[PDB]
Design a binder for this molecule. Sequence first.
Ligand code: SF4
Ligand code: SF4
Ligand code: SF4
Ligand code: SF4
Lengths: 444, 418
Amino acid sequence: AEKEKNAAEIRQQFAMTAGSPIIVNDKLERYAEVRTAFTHPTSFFKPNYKGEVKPWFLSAYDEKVRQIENGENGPKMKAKNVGEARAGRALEAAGWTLDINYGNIYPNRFFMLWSGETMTNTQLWAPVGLDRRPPDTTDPVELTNYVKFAARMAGADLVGVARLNRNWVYSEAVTIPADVPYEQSLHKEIEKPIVFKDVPLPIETDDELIIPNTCENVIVAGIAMNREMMQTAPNSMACATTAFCYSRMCMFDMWLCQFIRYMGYYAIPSCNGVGQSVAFAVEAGLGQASRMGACITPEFGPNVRLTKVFTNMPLVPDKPIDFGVTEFCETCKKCARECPSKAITEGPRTFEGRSIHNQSGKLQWQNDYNKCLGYWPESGGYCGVCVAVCPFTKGNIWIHDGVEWLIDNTRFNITEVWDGKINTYGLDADHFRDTVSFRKDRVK
Amino acid sequence: AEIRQQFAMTAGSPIIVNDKLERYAEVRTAFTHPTSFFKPNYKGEVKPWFLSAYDEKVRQIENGENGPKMKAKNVGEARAGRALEAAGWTLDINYGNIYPNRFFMLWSGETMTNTQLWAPVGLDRRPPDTTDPVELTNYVKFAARMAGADLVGVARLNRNWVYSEAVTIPADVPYEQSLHKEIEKPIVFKDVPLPIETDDELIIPNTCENVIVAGIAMNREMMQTAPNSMACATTAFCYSRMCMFDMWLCQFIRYMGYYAIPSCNGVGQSVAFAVEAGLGQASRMGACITPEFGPNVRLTKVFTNMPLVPDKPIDFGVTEFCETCKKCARECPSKAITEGPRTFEGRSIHNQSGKLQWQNDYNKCLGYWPESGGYCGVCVAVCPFTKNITEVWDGKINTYGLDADHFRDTVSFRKDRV
Ligand code: SF4
Ligand code: SF4
Ligand code: SF4
Ligand code: SF4
């Protein structure tokens, strides 16, 4: 008979010995965040469908408006009617409610404050003194259990811990000056170094973002997207599950930072800022890096968002996992064949970046992310076709052969989504048991 | 979904009222009224109730307790429970988000960062492309589930349950002075295009036909520790879930071409709205009891002119079960819950007279909160419909505290949305 799926058993089967899995050489240096395709001047501007060059997201807005007017849910994808096209973009737009400028990247601004002191919740609770009282627990084992429990309350579907590898922290952040209001933020972005110094608490000066040398650990969360909606990529409902999960990421960061602070430690939130989430996720054991560039997890494949919190709280690092992703990506190449911009390489991994958007000096599949971003104005969304077609995004990829777990090699419209299955936060009760957690799962 | 169809009743508010019913001023609640707001701490110092409760939390942590006369495993465990409680409230203002059109509860989306970022698309300025209440009901309920509701229902807006006057603050008062500068402000209905606040009035349009009610499920293991700290923590986390639900859903409704008023614990009486929208039935303890969660579920609501199909009220025997049960009343640590029958006359200023209900003494309830250092919840914990702290911390958990053993019960297809 079919063995009842056991996600915890799967993770124990593929656990590695300690050690960062990312292979590097001497040319590796920390990466300036301005180099990402979203921010770099070489890629930030894209033509709209009339050929006008604009910031990428404004050209993409022009295409969303055109599609609604034409009763479309995506590029050359007719909707049931104009009302349905409108509803998908209303859902997408609303999903972003708790996110600043598509990613919350500015450190120590808006939702991403590096201290809790000014938050309305901290002020309300100040008479209890939780953020001022020294820690009552310093045992990393108990702290790992407490913080992971808090993380699940805070909306993480996956959580892991790693020692902080500074190679993946941006050398300089993209941010705005402290006196600039929101309405001018996109006009006034600047660079600001992220440095490590012998200081007691995370602190920002006029010149630097200063992370203390005691900032030992990073906690990485996986926030699961909805499979039915992502499978509509590159159309509007894939944009909506993306958007809602960015607001879930924000809530997670603030909730968890506040818990850590109220435990007597400091905590730095980040969402899409501060450093490279995929690298942290691999080092924390959530999954393995893939050909498309994303972290593939056993539970969700790549159909999961990442965020992370940095802290001096003593914790037990998790072990990395190797469930064969590298070898499957070597022979699969489905994302590369289906990518509408041919951004994903069909070749082998190298240490040499394809362009300024890649960090050289680490062995990885080198993709052209300017080509990726170029398809977003064309399609009026955030694509996601690579995630949608990845075999690991399918549910029930795992089978048991009587001895051990293995991957099933055989695996290698929008009206119906609106009328079909949904549940709280887009989670799927057919698979939600996979992320149940007991103390045995949280700390060893 | 089969159970809910089996117990659907014919249309009509199931709350029985008489000719004495008047709308209720929010300042009368035990949290805000001057006769109940102040309570002594354990040293005998009279303070605002929540500050006296803070003193008890501090005392408990120092003494290694998770609750009144409940020893923790150690001081570290005691500290962790209160840290989790305090963190849970991150997205909530002054225990409930009650001030309308302040902080997270804005009545227009125009000034929000998300609306400003999306302004070039014009979704909030474009007339609706859908006016069909059937299609709108399916769209908005799908959105409500994305926004974190475990249950969602629609009712026509009964103004009897809208507060006659809200508790709020002046618009330009900063957060740090909010608690000391609370004021009362009328909520009125007028022929105006959009919800609007003047110096004198909170104005809801006469076109505000409907209320969308969400149920936000709490964690059963944690609530079972009532009145101790982990019950407080699931309470707190769900208040922040409520706030995010209201903002997400209001934005979706605005981007569909309609207006939307968030509320959380403000604007009107959630239990009455939830009963009229079919989420559950009112109970002896005073809560809406649902089939899926019993009373172990939080409520929020959004008011809108979006055309919608109202849901049917449900009757699965709660009234007859409460008539003979009395378990919450016997376990209540403050004897706040009556063992008598339902009447139309409130016991004190804190109750709204003129509706048939079990009349409870809610100042007695609030008095227990500084003594126990929490938000109690024993009545919810012991209710048959709802079915140590080290074991909770070491035990089962899942995303947002939801339980995969029961999560299938809230799956939704179009069939059950409209
Ligand atoms: S589609 Fe295939 S090659 Fe691409 S990430 Fe998924 S498994 Fe790897
Ligand atoms: S998001 Fe789309 S364009 Fe970008 S890499 Fe994936 S498939 Fe290609
Ligand atoms: S404990 Fe008994 S009387 Fe009280 S609300 Fe629950 S069922 Fe009704
Ligand atoms: S919360 Fe506690 S004190 Fe209040 S009515 Fe319920 S059992 Fe009684």
